[PDB]
Design an enzyme around this catalytic site. Structure first.
Site, PDB file in Angstrom:
ATOM      1  N   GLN A  66       0.807  -1.218   0.000  1.00 36.83           N
ATOM      2  CA  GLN A  66       0.000   0.000   0.000  1.00 36.83           C
ATOM      3  C   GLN A  66       0.836   1.261   0.000  1.00 36.83           C
ATOM      4  OE1 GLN A  66      -0.698   0.903   4.569  1.00 36.83           O
ATOM      5  NE2 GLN A  66      -1.849  -0.938   4.047  1.00 36.83           N
ATOM      6  N   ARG A 109      -3.720  11.018   2.477  1.00 39.30           N
ATOM      7  CA  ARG A 109      -4.900  11.572   3.156  1.00 39.30           C
ATOM      8  C   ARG A 109      -5.769  12.314   2.132  1.00 39.30           C
ATOM      9  NH1 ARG A 109      -0.410  11.970   6.234  1.00 39.30           N
ATOM     10  NH2 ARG A 109      -0.458  11.509   8.489  1.00 39.30           N
ATOM     11  N   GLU A 131      -4.229   3.423  -0.198  1.00 36.08           N
ATOM     12  CA  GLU A 131      -5.008   3.569   1.031  1.00 36.08           C
ATOM     13  C   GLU A 131      -5.354   5.032   1.167  1.00 36.08           C
ATOM     14  OE1 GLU A 131      -2.846   2.492   4.556  1.00 36.08           O
ATOM     15  OE2 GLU A 131      -4.290   3.406   5.932  1.00 36.08           O
ATOM     16  N   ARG A 182       9.001  19.577   0.429  1.00 36.30           N
ATOM     17  CA  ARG A 182       8.863  18.428  -0.470  1.00 36.30           C
ATOM     18  C   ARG A 182       9.176  17.100   0.211  1.00 36.30           C
ATOM     19  NH1 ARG A 182      10.284  23.017  -3.647  1.00 36.30           N
ATOM     20  NH2 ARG A 182       9.393  22.942  -5.757  1.00 36.30           N
ATOM     21  N   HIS A 220       4.696  11.428  -6.195  1.00 29.52           N
ATOM     22  CA  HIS A 220       3.557  11.001  -6.984  1.00 29.52           C
ATOM     23  C   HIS A 220       3.373   9.518  -6.930  1.00 29.52           C
ATOM     24  CE1 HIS A 220       7.115  11.154  -9.791  1.00 29.52           C
ATOM     25  NE2 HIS A 220       6.698   9.948 -10.180  1.00 29.52           N
ATOM     26  N   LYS A 227       9.917  18.789 -21.093  1.00 31.47           N
ATOM     27  CA  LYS A 227      11.130  18.125 -21.568  1.00 31.47           C
ATOM     28  C   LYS A 227      10.962  16.683 -22.018  1.00 31.47           C
ATOM     29  CE  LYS A 227      12.915  22.115 -20.209  1.00 31.47           C
ATOM     30  NZ  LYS A 227      13.985  22.265 -19.183  1.00 31.47           N
ATOM     31  N   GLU A 271       1.444  10.171 -12.252  1.00 33.52           N
ATOM     32  CA  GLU A 271       2.147  10.019 -13.524  1.00 33.52           C
ATOM     33  C   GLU A 271       1.405   8.992 -14.374  1.00 33.52           C
ATOM     34  OE1 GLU A 271       6.399   8.106 -14.821  1.00 33.52           O
ATOM     35  OE2 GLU A 271       6.345   9.336 -13.000  1.00 33.52           O
TER      36      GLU A 271
END
Ligand SMILES: CS(=O)(=O)Nc1cccc(-c2cc(-c3ccccc3)cc(=O)n2O)c1
Ligand SMILES: CS(=O)(=O)Nc1cccc(-c2cc(-c3ccccc3)cc(=O)n2O)c1
Ligand SMILES: [Zn+2]
Ligand SMILES: [Zn+2]
Lengths: 176, 182
Positions: free
Chosen positions: B32, B36, B98, B121, B125, B155, B171
């Site tokens: 998983q 949130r 999840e 950061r 993704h 790019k 993605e």
């Protein structure tokens, strides 16, 4: 309150035929130092580095980790990418070059303000024996199997502090 | 011509940090990824109708005021009806998502989660492999999906990023058309 089972089902749609072969391929996490992360994911967690992609023009590298047999990795370059990027359930570790040399830099694990992503989770046959081995290896724990309310479920951390759940699918129903 | 600088690790240095999988980990699987979500009604509609995933398990924890929604690329006809059997089957599927609903977030207009793609950061993704990035994105456009990167913009051509209702990046890639980007 939460949604009822019926209210949630009413929000769901059947799969459009154009999506029938889609697969959940990767989860991406940024890593400060790939040397530490590769050692953790391979030696501690038992994953395999199935592909490494360097992008010099953009100053980053991607490391694809998966629970795959190292002997299934193709020999040829282009064949390698097609196979690795078609494996389900991979972990993509992004190394933005130079973060390992910036002493003030660190990534955020999503479990304190601002929250979003929470964790990845590994299903194991025995949470207790897996965690006994992690303890022997000096792994950092957010939650030991028998800490708190939910017995037999653990959270460890990787070198960047991302949380990793350790669960046994056959021991989860009892927690309800 | 001079070549762009070569930072990071070499392939051999990266392999010097890798150890063979310990036999006690032979049955481990990556089960998983937890995110949130502010409104589970919008998230369930997105992941099922737009992406074609299936809601395989819904868990409610009233004392803790949250619910979990497990999404996966699984046939709905494989979902067991019996509660204990369903949990053991759902939590043993590879590559599930999840989605965590902390009750009440859907009513607060000033509340939103962080997607990890701006300071600070971390997570970036999730990614879905598809047979045709172009036809999948044409369909997402028809459905009003928000894009981060159209397939031929930027790019790397033939790779896209969309967003879910919370703004998490997804993605969209065709593994058979990635090697030509190196
Ligand atoms: C609200 S939170 O953000 O703090 N998350 C959270 C807290 C406690 C348990 C679990 C959990 C339960 C379960 C679970 C337990 C019993 C039965 C089914 C699922 C699965 C799972 O993956 N997780 O993470 C998740
Ligand atoms: C470095 S970043 O944080 O800005 N993320 C990012 C941006 C654009 C593309 C890719 C990417 C490429 C590739 C890739 C492209 C060509 C060949 C092999 C892999 C795979 C992949 O999963 N991703 O995400 C990753
Ligand atoms: Zn990616
Ligand atoms: Zn979880």
């Amino acid at each position: 309150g939460g949604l009822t089972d019926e209210a949630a089902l009413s929000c769901c749609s059947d799969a459009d035929p154009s999506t029938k072969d889609f697969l959940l391929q990767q989860t991406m996490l940024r890593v400060k130092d790939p040397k530490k992360s590769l050692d953790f994911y391979t030696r501690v967690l038992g994953m395999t580095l199935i592909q490494k992609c360097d992008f010099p023009i953009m100053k980053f590298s991607l490391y694809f980790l998966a629970y795959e047999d190292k002997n299934d990795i193709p020999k040829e370059k282009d064949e390698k990418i097609a196979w690795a990027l078609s494996r389900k359930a991979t972990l993509e570790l992004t190394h933005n070059w130079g973060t390992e040399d910036d002493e003030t830099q660190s990534y955020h694990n999503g479990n304190s303000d601002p929250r979003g992503f929470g964790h990845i989770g590994i299903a194991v046959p025995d949470v207790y024996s897996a965690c006994k081995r992690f303890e022997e290896l000096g792994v950092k724990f957010v939650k030991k199997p028998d800490d708190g309310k939910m017995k037999g479920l653990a959270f460890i951390q990787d070198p960047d502090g991302y949380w990793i759940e350790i669960l046994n699918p056959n021991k989860m129903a009892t927690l309800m």
